[PDB]
Symmetry: D3
Subunit: 72 residues, 6 copies
């Protein structure tokens, strides 16, 4: 699994969104599930090529954003 | 569905996030789908082990959480 | 055909499109025809529920009407 | 929903249907109505490919014809 | 969990387990607890169906027996 | 990475590819860039297992080899 899989990252007020190659969703997501609530991720949901991840309390959507880039 | 399939319920300003054992997400989200917008749930979406469920207008997240807890 | 998409609505965070069992990934696929330049930031489908959310600049409201347009 | 299915074929074990992206679940959902008495033992679907199989007392080709019946 | 398993039959190649919707992946993850050693090559679940296949050294009947065993 | 691909084996019906959790859709997409001309009838993939089949004129064994060659 290479960065070549994560096609794009952006976010808004409620969720942080990741775009990947088709079929790589669940794979990049399991990576995010390594992080966790105390690191800012309340949860994560992957489709085929999209991943919606959301911040925990104490965290802003931007905070999560920066934390994920660190993991990636 | 055994209550054991459900590992943890938590939330924030936009969604309630239910974690479950690998694989049980689609099964448990079935229960959440028993309810309709009326009880507050706009929609529900499960992946493999995470479920994001959101509220309808008039009910907040704190609301949906309590609601979910009652159903489980 | 259109029939598959049951209801469309929204709230504070996302727009939720329901479908007949199994068509969520197909209709959600329609949405992926859009893109950032038209409001859509991303879309996830399960079996029969799709959660699409607005990019910065648009609102969950703007996005909503745009999907009806698309449909 | 015909243009969804891109192909049908088979072999010494299953019937292999190909489809447009995300359709795998739609199409396989249609083949789930039939049941064992129609030949089918079961049906599975990934993202764009279904794999169906005839039950005890049925041939793959037969099944291939049967799906072609309800297609 | 067992009341989720609709039925268990089979044929020449696979052992098709039907389940309640969504139950699929859970029951299959159960079979995955077995592994090659018990005569299971590999398993794959959709939404409510589980196609499994025996390993060289056990036939389809045998897989079936050991599955009713597991269950 | 082919490390996401844990084990390969086959039988008288399909080639079974056990991969890391979630990797099953990605790697089936790799086998998906082959098809009939190379002997692949179809390939359906779950969360960590993938099931492929040889077309006509080709044997599962020939496929097991080609699959390693794809790898
Ligand atoms: N190959 C597909 N299923 N494409 C549709 C994907 C739709 C949406 N991005 C999701 O992840 O659910
Ligand atoms: N077996 C897996 N695919 N695990 C990864 C799960 C990714 C994400 N947490 C989801 O549930 O959608
Ligand atoms: N037949 C089912 N698997 N139903 C569960 C649906 C759960 C959720 N609404 C989703 O679309 O993912
Ligand atoms: N976008 C994808 N999921 N691509 C991989 C598809 C793999 C396999 N043909 C399936 O139907 O599951
Ligand atoms: N509610 C649904 N989407 N059902 C699809 C069933 C298709 C097939 N039986 C499978 O296991 O994938
Ligand atoms: N996390 C899971 N859903 N595990 C269950 C896997 C079941 C089966 N081996 C498949 O690939 O479909």
């Amino acid at each position: 699994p290479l960065k070549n899989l994560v096609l794009d990252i952006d976010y808004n007020d409620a969720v942080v969104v990741i775009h990947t190659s088709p079929g790589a969703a669940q794979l990049i997501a399991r990576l995010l599930d390594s992080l966790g609530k105390a690191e800012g991720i309340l949860g994560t949901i992957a489709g085929d090529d999209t991943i919606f991840t959301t911040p925990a309390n104490g965290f802003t959507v931007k905070d999560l954003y920066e934390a994920i880039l660190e993991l990636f």
